[PDB]
Design a protein around this ligand. Structure first.
Ligand SMILES: CCCCCCCCCCCC(=O)OC[C@H](COP(=O)(O)OCC[N+](C)(C)C)OC(=O)CCCCCCCCCCC
Ligand SMILES: CCCCCCCCCCCC(=O)OC[C@H](COP(=O)(O)OCC[N+](C)(C)C)OC(=O)CCCCCCCCCCC
Ligand SMILES: CCCCCCCCCCCC(=O)OC[C@H](COP(=O)(O)OCC[N+](C)(C)C)OC(=O)CCCCCCCCCCC
Ligand SMILES: CCCCCCCCCCCC(=O)OC[C@H](COP(=O)(O)OCC[N+](C)(C)C)OC(=O)CCCCCCCCCCC
Ligand SMILES: CCCCCCCCCCCC(=O)OC[C@H](COP(=O)(O)OCC[N+](C)(C)C)OC(=O)CCCCCCCCCCC
Ligand SMILES: CCCCCCCCCCCCO[C@@H]1O[C@H](CO)[C@@H](O[C@H]2O[C@H](CO)[C@@H](O)[C@H](O)[C@H]2O)[C@H](O)[C@H]1O
Ligand SMILES: CC(C)c1cccc(C(C)C)c1O
Ligand SMILES: CC(C)c1cccc(C(C)C)c1O
Ligand SMILES: CC(C)c1cccc(C(C)C)c1O
Ligand SMILES: CC(C)c1cccc(C(C)C)c1O
Ligand SMILES: CC(C)c1cccc(C(C)C)c1O
Lengths: 311, 311, 311, 311, 311
């Protein structure tokens, strides 16, 4: 067993195809996802060709070890895929049709900039390293690229599974490498974030603003501080579900901005009390009266600015 | 070793049967469950048929590698099942009786809409890809589908383990695929949710309503804010045990609605104090007096509406 | 390699023995435990008979694949046991003495009703399915059932490791199955629960009762609410360490009952303040005075009732 | 392949040696540690002996399967070690020199009594079961017992890696077993516990004692209750990092004792207020004044007593 | 298969090269990282040499088992690497060119002193043990040491992947061991720590200092205690993400220092109230007025001192 030789001096074309059976475990923190799919391989090996009329058989079967099979590997995997050879069929002209069922944990980075309203493009990079006797080149058989209807990825919507038809051929350690890009397009199901994180977070912030309709320093301190602690809880909960990004995310920005509002509300609450003690409740009253309008307006304005910058 | 050829031009019928030995690890967040069961396979291979007379044995035992065995796979599995061939028996007419003991992590989505009062239908999809020489079709031998009496799935009740007798035959990459649906019907044991999450959650909310029988703003702010923090704790605890659904769940709805009650109670508490400071305790008194009846009534009404919409 | 044949028409007796080397990872939530032990098997295969004269050796040593070995499996395991064949010895008569060292994660349900003062009976079910040529029956060789003295299972006391001598023989999918029950009796080391969960929990509850010697509504609200939050913390901590049971557990009952005490204390605290504001401190004083006695008495009575019902 | 026969009737001496390459993952809760080391084995097999002069080769190398190798196993392991045979060398006299590189998860109990100022002795028990033809006995070749200089075990100091030279020979299931004890002496790096758990815990307790210089019941209730909640947090954090011991640990004792101080401080705070309301501030003043001295003195005394009892 | 013999009496040089394909899972607590890379090996084996003319081939391909391949192992790995032989090529002079693709979990300690502004040098130690017939020495072929452009390690910046050309040759258990050091230089992406941990932590501290512009003991106690609890939360969050170091880290120092500020602020708050009750508000006023300047100044000074000592 060694590579099929060239008729002229052409490279060996191995036609590929990935058909997704299962999608699961998209881990945001790890930036990984699990896949269960069919891997299809097709190439011509003339040494295997036969007569259809004389052989009586139109197709011949082979056990993996019996024939030369190209070493196709995945670039972005944690460990080498778990493969089960489903079938090897050889047609009269020496065209081989290989099929395996595999499962792998794919490493594909995610862009957290618009979280939880983000969309992603997951990648599966197929690769083949050229042998000394000949160069191996990959290609996409669009007929054998797909996914089953039931393929569901929890908390995400599956847009498309396509392959970039033109392989990226390059030199690596003094030998040719032919690389293919299979792309899984998904978009996050943001629904649940609204009643679980967004609205609770806004409610606790609005509750803090009731201190603008109270002259009790002791009650205000409780209002602002308490809600600030609940905000820290939400911040912590949110940051545990996400990886540490070198860029600012949409959620990150909002969560951060909100801290400034709690800080300024504390200052206001302190100022109001200070003036009151200092026997000037009229300045204190106008500062509070302003804040009543200022706080929601600046909050609403700031959010528009951020949504603009982010979307 | 290659498929048994057709007498006429009929497809090969493989008679299946799953007998559950163990059920465990139903992970709600992951929407997976672990299973340990017997897989039974039966098909006719005439090339193996014999005369009971001349041979002097009414059965024939084989090692897996010695005979042709159909490639039965599970659709909804994380990784290929762990199988141990228990026995392979051949009857005089060439009827093969295959038995294996397997364990697998099955991916089956759950409908969280009625959580924790929900019921589920877990699936085990058996599949067979047809060969070039012939088409393979699956069938259910009802005699070999079951579960042992001891099969317990922690915090769930096992209703039934049945199989949809008629397979779903379809084309996949120009070959025939025959798919069978084994269904495990279960219903959640909601008991524990009552004293652990439900009642504590209601108690903390009722405690918040004592602020309707108090004129102390400072005590009221403490009552409502404190309990709101305890509610956030319960919300967080609940949401960590569940996956992110694109739909509203029953518990989700309740938890969410309750936030509105805390928000409105804060408003009431603020209003009462504001009026009192503004030297009009009679308006404040009537608002408070109404709230004492309004809050429980609207809570009880809202819950009826929700239970109705959900069940 | 196929079963040894009967002299008369007797079933094959495979003697068994489990000798525990290691016990670890008793997971309460999962209701699983890990075991590392010796599995001993002994059956007569006359086909292996030999003359020590003609063969030199008094006992013959065989490699697993060389001889017929009965397929012994465990019923209540997650996955097939990790086995290492330690020795296979055949005496001249053909008596086979098989020894393997295995490790497995055993699934055995637990009765949480008396937690953390509960005792358990863990099971290891050995099984053998009968072949077509002959019936296989299991037996216990009491001489080969044990555990080493060092066998420690963290936070549990090991009472006994015994086997139910009489196997449970039954039909399963048209063949005989011989099942054996090995029983590991253990009892929980409740010590640590006293200073870690019990006493802290009682202290925080007693602290709440100081509100019965205070006329300050604002301090009382803080006392009762604060401690209630600390109780929720303990409840959550406790419930994370346990699986969701369809029955009430001893700890569960106590934790639940305590909520009622916090609820009633809030009511009392509210009533006392209401009456005081309403210019009737004498009724308030007598209600408080009774509560000081009522609360500890009813708590102590309720606990006796519960301990009675549970033990 | 079968055991080398005795010259006289002596047992087979297997010389052992463990050389630690990597030490990691000391899990306190699980009472396990991971090891990566060389396992050296040496015995005499006269059947393999040769002429030094006539052969012209000083030593001869073999493949595992070619020769008889004793079955050395570890007693206290989770699962059977991952071994790679590095080399097998036979000298002229028939002395076999075996070397393998292994990795295993060792189960070794820990004494938490002096945590986090404790020291431990981790064990690796080598074992060999005697064959029918002859008895196998283990020995330590001190020349081949060691560890590399870089061997670091995070948050622990490695004192020594030694072996108890005299094996423990005993009967187990009617055959001789020769057991060796390799001991890894380590001591915990307590440094970090000081600024992370100890000092914060003491600071929150001291903060609680400021209530002895305050006449405000409402502020005191806040001071004592708040800090008590922070103490519960530390207790919980500490207990999550440790297994449930049937004995009292040093930290456990301290954490527990501190609860009593919070309880008594609440009593004091209640008493002071009660007396003040009851128009007797002079008794209240002297009780508070005493507490100011009593609390730190009894704390300091109690700690000395405990440190004494524990070290 | 045995080592290629020396022409003179030279040691065998094995040229090495590591080309990183993937980098992931840098676990700070565990001090481990996962790698996926190509391992290249090249040595001269004269026994494999051939005349290009009588062969009609420029190269010769071999299956691992067919030829002698040196046993290269990694020193700092958890378990033996997962390797797939990609290719084995032999040039006419008997120069062997070996290529494998591997994945391993590398144990490499980290210096937490400047966290989260730290940089690290991860190591991959290649090792070879010398055989009896001859000594094996490792060498770096700089042409075959690299990483692909896509190599990303989440939350870290990859500076360089280089190899220390000169191997460290030494004796280990009477055999010569040749060790090579491959170094991955990385630096932490500190960005996210600023809005997630740093700024929130500073804000809660500044909020505590508003008590210097308040005469209300009850509000102050709330301000300082509340924020202290939020600080404990951040401390706990930070310490869970890091391993226990025997040295003080930069973050560790800051977190610790901040506790002292909370403690002193409580003292101030206590003193101010004490004096006020004791009818001397002028001393109290000047102490408070000083603190307003003292606290930020000493905080700013302390930080400069620390940043100096650490960077
Ligand atoms: C918010 C927001 O700003 O949300 C924006 C997103 C839509 O963003 P997108 O679908 O990625 O559009 C990407 C294309 N262009 C021009 C933006 C680039 O959310 C939604 O549709 C629903 C909003 C949820 C409402 C929040 C309730 C409180
Ligand atoms: C609540 C609820 O509304 O609970 C409803 C469920 C029963 O719902 P089901 O068995 O799925 O009925 C499904 C069939 N039809 C018409 C509804 C579709 O809970 C129970 O029986 C027990 C109620 C627990 C009491 C809560 C105590 C506070
Ligand atoms: C409590 C309790 O009620 O605890 C009962 C258990 C003993 O229960 P048992 O050993 O299972 O007896 C089972 C047999 N009969 C009749 C009960 C069935 O705890 C103890 O011995 C120690 C009590 C811990 C003290 C709690 C301190 C606060
Ligand atoms: C405390 C303690 O009591 O700590 C004692 C240990 C030393 O204990 P050891 O090294 O095990 O001595 C074992 C031998 N004999 C007689 C004790 C048996 O801590 C230290 O050296 C450092 C003390 C940390 C200071 C705590 C700061 C607050
Ligand atoms: C802080 C600090 O002190 O941060 C110092 C580091 C730079 O330290 P370095 O790159 O390792 O310099 C190592 C070389 N010499 C002389 C220092 C040894 O952070 C930064 O550049 C950005 C600072 C973040 C701002 C914090 C905002 C609040
Ligand atoms: C697997 C990981 C699991 C991680 C689990 C993490 C759990 C987090 C614990 C949350 C801490 C709650 O924080 C707590 O909330 C209440 C809100 O009523 C605050 O308290 C506020 O009102 C109370 C009650 O009147 C006062 O005692 C208090 O002084 C005041 O500041 C407490 O001061 C605060 O300490
Ligand atoms: C969590 C984060 C994404 C967020 C929080 C609160 C409010 C908003 C907008 C939609 C107003 C928001 O986008
Ligand atoms: C958790 C959620 C399911 C829930 C909480 C509180 C009350 C109710 C009804 C039964 C009143 C409820 O269904
Ligand atoms: C945790 C639970 C088991 C419990 C809590 C508090 C008190 C008691 C009895 C022993 C009084 C108790 O059994
Ligand atoms: C955590 C536990 C070990 C502890 C806490 C606080 C104080 C001390 C002594 C050293 C005073 C202590 O040993
Ligand atoms: C977390 C720790 C690294 C830290 C916290 C707060 C402030 C600072 C400096 C940059 C002022 C800091 O370095």
């Amino acid at each position: 067993v060694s590579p099929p030789p060239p008729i002229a001096d052409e490279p060996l074309t191995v036609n590929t195809g990935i058909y997704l059976i299962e999608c699961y475990s998209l881990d945001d923190k790890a930036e990984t996802f699990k896949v269960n799919a069919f891997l299809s391989l097709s190439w011509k090996d003339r040494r295997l060709a036969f007569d259809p009329v004389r052989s009586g058989v139109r197709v011949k079967t082979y056990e993996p070890e019996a024939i030369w099979i190209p070493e196709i590997r995945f670039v972005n995997v944690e460990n080498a895929r778990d493969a089960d050879v489903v079938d090897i069929s050889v047609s009269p002209d020496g065209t081989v049709q290989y099929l395996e069922r595999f499962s792998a944990r794919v490493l594909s980075p995610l862009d957290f900039r618009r979280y939880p309203f983000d969309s992603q493009t997951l990648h599966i990079y197929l690769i083949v390293r050229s042998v000394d006797t000949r160069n191996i080149v990959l290609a996409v058989d669009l007929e054998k690229v797909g996914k089953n209807d039931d393929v569901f990825l929890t908390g995400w919507d599956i847009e498309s599974f396509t392959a970039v038809v033109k392989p990226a051929n390059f030199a690596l350690e003094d030998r040719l490498e032919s690389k293919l890009d299979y792309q899984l397009r998904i978009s996050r199901q943001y629904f649940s974030y609204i009643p679980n994180i967004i609205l609770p977070m806004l409610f606790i912030l609005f509750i803090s603003w009731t201190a603008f309709w109270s002259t009790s320093y002791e009650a205000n301190v409780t209002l602002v501080v308490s809600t600030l602690i609940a905000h820290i809880a939400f911040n912590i909960l949110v940051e545990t579900n996400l990886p540490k990004t070198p860029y600012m995310t949409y959620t990150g920005a909002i969560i951060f901005m909100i801290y400034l509002f709690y800080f300024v509300a504390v200052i206001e609450v302190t100022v109001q009390h200070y003036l009151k003690v200092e026997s000037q409740p009229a300045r204190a009253a106008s500062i509070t009266r302003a804040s009543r309008i200022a706080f929601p307006v600046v909050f609403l304005l700031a959010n528009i600015i951020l949504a603009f910058l982010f979307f």
